Amino acid sequence: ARTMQTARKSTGGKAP
Amino acid sequence: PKGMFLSQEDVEAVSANATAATTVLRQLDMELVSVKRQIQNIKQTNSALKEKLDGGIEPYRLPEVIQKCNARWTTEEQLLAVQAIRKYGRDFQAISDVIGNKSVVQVKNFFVNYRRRFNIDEVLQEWEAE
Amino acid sequence: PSGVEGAAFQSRLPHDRMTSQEAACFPDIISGPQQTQKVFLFIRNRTLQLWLDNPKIQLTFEATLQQLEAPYNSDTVLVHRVHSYLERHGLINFGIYKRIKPLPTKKTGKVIIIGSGVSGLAAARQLQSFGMDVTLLEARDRVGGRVATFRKGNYVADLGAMVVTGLGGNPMAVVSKQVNMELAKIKQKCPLYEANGQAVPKEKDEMVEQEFNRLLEATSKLSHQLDFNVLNNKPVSLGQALEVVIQLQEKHVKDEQIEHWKKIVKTQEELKELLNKMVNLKEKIKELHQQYKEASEVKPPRDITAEFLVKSKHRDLTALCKEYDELAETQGKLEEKLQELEANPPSDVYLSSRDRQILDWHFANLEFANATPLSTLSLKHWDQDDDFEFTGSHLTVRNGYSCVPVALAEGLDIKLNTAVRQVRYTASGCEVIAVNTRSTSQTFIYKCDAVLCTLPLGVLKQQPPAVQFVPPLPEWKTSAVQRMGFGNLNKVVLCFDRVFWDPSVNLFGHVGSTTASRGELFLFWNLYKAPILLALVAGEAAGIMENISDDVIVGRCLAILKGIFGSSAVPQPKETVVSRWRADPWARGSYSYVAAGSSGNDYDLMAQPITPGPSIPGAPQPIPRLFFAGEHTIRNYPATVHGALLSGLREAGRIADQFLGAMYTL
Numbered sequence: 001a002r003t004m005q006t007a008r009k010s011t012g013g014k015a016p
Numbered sequence: 017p018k019g020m021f022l023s024q025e026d027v028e029a030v031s032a033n034a035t036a037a038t039t040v041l042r043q044l045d046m047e048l049v050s051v052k053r054q055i056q057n058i059k060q061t062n063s064a065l066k067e068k069l070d071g072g073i074e075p076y077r078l079p080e081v082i083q084k085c086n087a088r089w090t091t092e093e094q095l096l097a098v099q100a101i102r103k104y105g106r107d108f109q110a111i112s113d114v115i116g117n118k119s120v121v122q123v124k125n126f127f128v129n130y131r132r133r134f135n136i137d138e139v140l141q142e143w144e145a146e
Numbered sequence: 147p148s149g150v151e152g153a154a155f156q157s158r159l160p161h162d163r164m165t166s167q168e169a170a171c172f173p174d175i176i177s178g179p180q181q182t183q184k185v186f187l188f189i190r191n192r193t194l195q196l197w198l199d200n201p202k203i204q205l206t207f208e209a210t211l212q213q214l215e216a217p218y219n220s221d222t223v224l225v226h227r228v229h230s231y232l233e234r235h236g237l238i239n240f241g242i243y244k245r246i247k248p249l250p251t252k253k254t255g256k257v258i259i260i261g262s263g264v265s266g267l268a269a270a271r272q273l274q275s276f277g278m279d280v281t282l283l284e285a286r287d288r289v290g291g292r293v294a295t296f297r298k299g300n301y302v303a304d305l306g307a308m309v310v311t312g313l314g315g316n317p318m319a320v321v322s323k324q325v326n327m328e329l330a331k332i333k334q335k336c337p338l339y340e341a342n343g344q345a346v347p348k349e350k351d352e353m354v355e356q357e358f359n360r361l362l363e364a365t366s367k368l369s370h371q372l373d374f375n376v377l378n379n380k381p382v383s384l385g386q387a388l389e390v391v392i393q394l395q396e397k398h399v400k401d402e403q404i405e406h407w408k409k410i411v412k413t414q415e416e417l418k419e420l421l422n423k424m425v426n427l428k429e430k431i432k433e434l435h436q437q438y439k440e441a442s443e444v445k446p447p448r449d450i451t452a453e454f455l456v457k458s459k460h461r462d463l464t465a466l467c468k469e470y471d472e473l474a475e476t477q478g479k480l481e482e483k484l485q486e487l488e489a490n491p492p493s494d495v496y497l498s499s500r501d502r503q504i505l506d507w508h509f510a511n512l513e514f515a516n517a518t519p520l521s522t523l524s525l526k527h528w529d530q531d532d533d534f535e536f537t538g539s540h541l542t543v544r545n546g547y548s549c550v551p552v553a554l555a556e557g558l559d560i561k562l563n564t565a566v567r568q569v570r571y572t573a574s575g576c577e578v579i580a581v582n583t584r585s586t587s588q589t590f591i592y593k594c595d596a597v598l599c600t601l602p603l604g605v606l607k608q609q610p611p612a613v614q615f616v617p618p619l620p621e622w623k624t625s626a627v628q629r630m631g632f633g634n635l636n637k638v639v640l641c642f643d644r645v646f647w648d649p650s651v652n653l654f655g656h657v658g659s660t661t662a663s664r665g666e667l668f669l670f671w672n673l674y675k676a677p678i679l680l681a682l683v684a685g686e687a688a689g690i691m692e693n694i695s696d697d698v699i700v701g702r703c704l705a706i707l708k709g710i711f712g713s714s715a716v717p718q719p720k721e722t723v724v725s726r727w728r729a730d731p732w733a734r735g736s737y738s739y740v741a742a743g744s745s746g747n748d749y750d751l752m753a754q755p756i757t758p759g760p761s762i763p764g765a766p767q768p769i770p771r772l773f774f775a776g777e778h779t780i781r782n783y784p785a786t787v788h789g790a791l792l793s794g795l796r797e798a799g800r801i802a803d804q805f806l807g808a809m810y811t812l
């Protein structure tokens with residue numbers, strides 16, 4: 001899932 | 017973040033069917049073409065008018081006479097007045113440029129002192145007809 | 147965090163609140179007074195700390211009480227209850243510790259574990275640690291499952307799991323302390339490079355990446371705010387939502403041009419109407435000035451009406467010369483309000499090809515994170531586990547990730563080349579039939595009290611069944627199996643005789659020309675000591691490139707590399723390796739994902755054990771017999787190694803609780 005990203009982690013839609 | 021421009025109304029207008037997306041996008045694409053070449057139309061209509069107005073009004077401006085205002089009424093200026101009233105009504109401004117050396121107030125004065133003698137009443141009701 | 151609170155956070159637990167789990171084992175405490183909760187919570191949080199401090203030795207109960215300070219060391223049964231719950235659920239004494247008390251002389255219960263994948267091994271170790279008899283059946287001739295590490299000479303490269311997603315709260319952190327692992331940090335700089343072989347310029351790269359994340363945040367608000375979640379009675383995928391959001395942007399660019407050009411016509415038309423008034427005055431002026439010229443022809447002296455005709459036409463023309471001057475005055479304001487608009491146009495496009503092919507790369511990056519086309523992801527739920535993200539740098543295991551499953555396998559009864567085939571689960575116990583993968587013909591029968599199934603979700607999805615369940619799994623489980631997503635992502639590994647890339651940057655992108663090819667060789671990794679470059683193949687490209695021979699693929703690979711670094715600095719690779727995980731009969735895909743129409747609650751159904759019906763009619767409802775572990779069962783940590791690990795710790799505790807009883811719950 002999103003968790004999984006290393007490169008250019010995606011942020012939109014995530015709750016900081 | 018920076019919440020995209022996203023209205024409720026816009027959404028199903030792109031989801032209604034498979035290509036309702038490319039429906040409205042092509043409706044705007046041609047709408048822009050429509051106005052864009054309309055601009056080129058009036059941009060040329062206006063280019064023609066701009067050329068007809070060549071020279072400006074330079075050959076046609078008459079040096080305006082700068083001359084001092086006087087008090088008394090030479091029978092001449094009296095008579096310019098009565099015809100200025102017949103042609104201009106109550107414009108007192110105009111009557112003051114025509115007469116030339118009277119300001120706008122003794123213009124007014126005139127209407128009352130010479131009221132009876134120059135029958136301004138008939139002159140002015142004559143002007144209202146027209 | 148720091149102190150006993152940090153121990154709690156490193157064990158994925160709130161330091162100041164009791165969890166739903168402990169509500170279950172300590173319902174006396176939870177329903178009790180606020181003070182006792184605090185005692186427990188300190189006792190809990192304290193204990194993990196001593197385990198977390200030294201995880202290379204067993205943390206015995208006596209040990210814990212010894213190091214507890216009053217007033218907490220005062221109530222011993224509470225300390226025993228806590229220490230036992232912690233030990234049961236793999237919050238302490240898990241992984242590879244030296245044992246203090248030795249393993250029980252004669253065991254109790256028999257568990258058969260299908261799969262020696264990491265989740266598999268995880269359970270096996272706990273169960274054996276609890277005095278049970280455990281055997282693992284593994285179809286492969288090695289233990290890793292989807293942790294697969296290529297090795298030849300000095301070359302080393304994982305075709306499976308590669309990255310620890312940061313030690314902040316990671317149980318993988320505990321393993322690395324216990325186990326030799328060379329953990330190496332991944333520095334975040336990732337240059338992109340378009341199809342030409344030359345870098346994206348910093349301007350472009352920040353403007354697209356930012357627009358991407360903006361598009362993502364948009365979809366989130368379609369999902370949760372605007373409730374955009376059904377469309378022609380299918381669920382919305384992240385893919386669709388992405389297109390509807392881009393279509394909305396591409397629309398907005400066109401209203402902005404239309405409203406601005408429409409501003410130009412509203413003033414070019416006021417100009418028209420004013421130029422008309424100005425020709426119609428040059429016309430009146432033309433004829434007036436004539437008339438004045440004919441009236442000054444009469445030469446003075448002249449009677450006073452003739453004198454006023456000259457004087458009149460003079461006022462009348464000067465007055466019309468005023469009216470015309472006020473009008474090319476105002477023609478000045480409009481004529482420059484128009485070089486004003488035409489100077490500031492709104493932007494011409496939403497996105498150009500060069501932009502969109504770069505935005506595609508960020509979608510490839512999402513399609514890699516989920517191992518699936520965004521057209522299959524659930525809009526609402528794809529990211530539903532983001533809350534449990536770890537902290538810290540991501541890392542690589544520089545000596546190969548397989549060194550972890552291998553280390554875990556030490557001490558365990560593991561049968562290799564043993565392909566399970568049928569699982570029979572009955573009121574009285576369980577038989578599992580396996581064949582030998584080499585000589586299919588040698589058949590095996592395994593009887594046991596319970597079976598732990600860590601079969602990959604793709605294996606479970608296989609049509610026709612690669613494994614028969616007897617009796618068939620209930621509809622509620624098999625429905626969750628379809629709904630769940632099992633996707634694909636592959637890896638190409640290139641070994642060279644010399645470093646030709648930038649040795650101080652660990653990764654870099656390649657940008658695809660097509661949207662279709664956006665997954666194809668889109669991401670590279672320099673990770674290991676040897677000169678190895680490793681390339682990802684995600685998205686829709688994942689399934690495609692399996693059909694294509696290695697050579698063709700290593701071709702497109704060396705091609706992209708040549709464009710980047712120059713056709714003369716790129717040697718022939720010494721050794722090459724292409725993964726094919728959907729083809730792999732024991733994988734059937736790469737890892738799981740929240741498919742459209744699924745939720746993360748399907749992960750929970752996935753982990754619910756099965757209880758067979760009575761042998762004798764009217765005999766009472768049995769003890770659950772069939773358990774499930776693996777990455778596709780752990781909702782809050784899907785599709786990772788540490789999640790598999792966690793799921794194995796989970797089932798192992800749940801099994802032991804069902805078969806050795808839980809003294810710690812009274």
Ligand SMILES: Cc1cc2nc3c(=O)[nH]c(=O)nc-3n(C[C@H](O)[C@H](O)[C@H](O)COP(=O)(O)OP(=O)(O)OC[C@H]3O[C@@H](n4cnc5c(N)ncnc54)[C@H](O)[C@@H]3O)c2cc1C
Pocket residue numbers: 260261262263264265266283284285286288289290291292293305306307308309310311564565566567600601602605612613635636637727731732733735736737775776777778784785786787788790
């Ligand atoms: C290409 C790729 C890259 C990845 N990279 C990362 C990463 O960087 N970080 C991360 O955290 N995670 C990563 N993962 C995910 C991680 O590898 C998995 O989530 C995890 O290893 C799965 O563990 P599991 O124990 O549930 O399944 P597995 O590890 O697959 O274990 C299941 C076992 O069952 C065996 N088996 C299957 N069928 C049978 C049968 N019929 N009989 C007997 N045995 C059978 C299999 O051979 C296997 O050994 C990656 C996965 C892939 C595919």
